[PDB]
Design a protein around this ligand. Sequence first.
Ligand SMILES: NC(=O)c1ccc[n+]([C@@H]2O[C@H](COP(=O)([O-])OP(=O)(O)OC[C@H]3O[C@@H](n4cnc5c(N)ncnc54)[C@H](OP(=O)(O)O)[C@@H]3O)[C@@H](O)[C@H]2O)c1
Lengths: 231, 240, 249, 246
Amino acid sequence: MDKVCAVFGGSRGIGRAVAQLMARKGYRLAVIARNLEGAKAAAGDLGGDHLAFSCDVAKEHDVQNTFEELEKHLGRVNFLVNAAGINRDGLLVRTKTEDMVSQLHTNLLGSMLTCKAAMRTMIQQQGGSIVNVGSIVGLKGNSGQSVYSASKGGLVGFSRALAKEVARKKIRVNVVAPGFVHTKEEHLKKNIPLGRFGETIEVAHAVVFLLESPYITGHVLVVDGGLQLIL
Amino acid sequence: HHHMDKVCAVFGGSRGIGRAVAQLMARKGYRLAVIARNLEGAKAAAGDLGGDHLAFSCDVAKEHDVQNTFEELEKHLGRVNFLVNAAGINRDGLLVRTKTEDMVSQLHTNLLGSMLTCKAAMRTMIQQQGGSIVNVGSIVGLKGNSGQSVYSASKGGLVGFSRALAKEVARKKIRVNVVAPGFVHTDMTKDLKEEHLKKNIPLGRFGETIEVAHAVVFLLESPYITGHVLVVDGGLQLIL
Amino acid sequence: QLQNRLRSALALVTGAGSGIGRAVSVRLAGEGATVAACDLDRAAAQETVRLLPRGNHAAFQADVSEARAARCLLEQVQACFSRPPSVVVSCAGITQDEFLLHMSEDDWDKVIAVNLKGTFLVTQAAAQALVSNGCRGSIINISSIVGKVGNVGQTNYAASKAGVIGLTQTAARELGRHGIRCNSVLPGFIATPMTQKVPQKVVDKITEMIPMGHLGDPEDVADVVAFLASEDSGYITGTSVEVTGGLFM
Amino acid sequence: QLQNRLRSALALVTGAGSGIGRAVSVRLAGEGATVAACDLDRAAAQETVRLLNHAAFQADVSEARAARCLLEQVQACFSRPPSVVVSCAGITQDEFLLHMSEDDWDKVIAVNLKGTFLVTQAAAQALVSNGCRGSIINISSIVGKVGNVGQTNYAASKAGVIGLTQTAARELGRHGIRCNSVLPGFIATPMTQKVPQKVVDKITEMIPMGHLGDPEDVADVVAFLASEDSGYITGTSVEVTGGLFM
Ligand SMILES: NC(=O)c1ccc[n+]([C@@H]2O[C@H](COP(=O)([O-])OP(=O)(O)OC[C@H]3O[C@@H](n4cnc5c(N)ncnc54)[C@H](OP(=O)(O)O)[C@@H]3O)[C@@H](O)[C@H]2O)c1
């Protein structure tokens, strides 16, 4: 029941900020991505004892063998962070099926595969915490981001469905729904109540919070700065 | 009478909600296209509707089947300015006991299939400076349910997609909405404990296909409603 | 087009003397429902009735914020038509806009009393009138899109409208096994006298924010209300229906 | 460690005399925040302070005069406005809609909704006047989202709290004042001991975690919202229900 967390997509952006923050808190992190060179660089500045792995979460067995490497080198994974995702803006009319299937398997199906592989370990230990990084556009939608919205709206119902299913096994699943994160904004940042774009470390603090809160599951924590009130 | 310039494409209109949506819109004056994988079943559906209404065979998972269907759709009935996505499958099962193939199956049928459908409808709805789309989701899609993990995921993205599309094409006089029915008497809710469940439900019963159908028609005919999720569960969402 | 959908239905509409409430009364009467138009201004209520098989429509005067007026209203309708209203709509609402730092206690209490307490009293009295007669019914409470997201200068208005939602959800849960449906309408900005109190350029900015790119007409709200009133939505209760044009979806 | 997370904060907590408000005071003080424990009960607030420089206050949040008086008592004792404001003051007068009296409606609304408005308003005014940023935390309920039988007045108030806080967050964003709502499920408190045991058993079966929450669980989210770690979170409803009515 130690402090070991698996952060998929922890080489860049939010997932990288999540790994950075949990390393300062004393967690044993694993930085997972496709580009292993990026994962190593991320887990390199994360202090020491942190490992890096290569995995395409859109693949059924790629994530399988990645978890058996996790279990083998880090041990039981107590915390799962699904921050792996892709985004290519474009109109639905100007979006070929290949890109539509691509984002779906990465942003949605990918998180379903990872959460599934983390089950039998967390189930046998009767303890585990999962946070799936989504978006505000996954719920409220945004123009030119239909495919991304579907993929990010899907794992909201998924995380909740998994929550009611595994809550009796002392396992919690939550969703962080960030808004505009800094990583164009002039006629947009003025709208937001806080008057600025967010930071990856600010989103990361929300992620860690959901993982450490004992009575929170199936909840969608929004980190937007009041954007959802005007979006 | 006059020109039937109100054409509706009901995907999954062979049975259940889609068939009911079909039957109801057929009497309201709309010209219909009963669409499903099983051509024999879709043909029988369009039979009791009328001679003006045609049946087509299509699997929404395949992009080309959708493309070829909309091609034959226009070259026989005219431009499609109304859309109903009632094509979807369900498989109850624990996530740990769920095959990846079964995941991709529901995701492509219920979610990706409804995206390809809306995509092809854009062409005909822009060419008529007006359209209305109803995507049939579920009250489980946003709330989730133990055993309906993959289904919740597929139905979940349907809301974010329809809303993102609603904003994207609202200026082209095209409305996109979602119907969120609860427990409805179809082939999908065949082996469900209607006894132990309905004791909680405020209306104390399950919904019929025509009750969801009326909601679909309502959203299609509500000129100032887009990107909305209409809930037809008899008050189930207050307990779920 | 679709009259006689509410042929055998008595409809009570509070705040029917103007805007949405007026359009609702016209739409309901347009589908066959005898409308009991209620409004604080009786002259406005009578004007609505003038713009409309059994008997005729009736105008009622009542301050929905007062518990006694809420009871006497229902009793007077039952006295006039010898039956409780099968359809009840609460359009009685006011605005007293002010920033949070400057909002007085009166600007708060008044909006709450009319929009929140007023709706509660109308809902309660109408429900009691339906239970004591074994009559099914549909209660429709006009909330707002503000009641879901809040709005600048409307601390009192948003709190009231949000309260209506939590109120209707509770009413639907209790009146469910009594054959009474309860739903809330969440309109965006509508071309009503209430929005004529909004500065023209603010309306301009709002218009360019609404995805459809225009203010909805009161008839759009009436369409939703007419649907919730009919048995076409017989399996719809405890539901919030948004008619915003995509605003704040 | 988080025991210095709120070392520089002055926290005002209404309803700090019992249940959640007391647990909130414990957590905040446990993180270095000097707590201004307020409550309708004079002794309960003082005993809360005793369990925790700290100070106790008495006020009726439902009354406008007592609200502005409370904030003035704080700014006088600590020579500063409270950077953290938590509204846990709430009551319950359950009765069916058909049988709910006017008084049972008026009192719950005044305390839970209006009482929260006055505190939030007076808090913001004290922060804007001194040019000090802050975080306002209003304790709503999961009932505010879906409603609950016998709690028409309670659900209306709690739902009103959310829209209230959402409005505040959008208006006070320019002054660096974050406003958020906490939506807790059923928690082992004296308030929960009011409802009958037979119903408590059913609820526990409905809760996905299969048990009532602890007041410390609610304070855990309040401490986070009060911190700089949520410096980009405003107008957000946080749910602590154990999955109940997600
Ligand atoms: N029934 C409920 O309680 C309930 C609850 C929530 C949501 N819904 C939604 O309501 C909709 C219809 O209700 P139902 O499914 O319960 O009735 P149903 O009897 O299951 O009808 C489903 C229809 O979808 C078609 N379909 C299935 N897979 C398809 C594919 N890959 N491509 C094209 N068409 C396909 C079927 O036609 P074929 O004969 O070709 O398969 C059939 O006509 C579903 O989409 C479901 O998501 C229903």
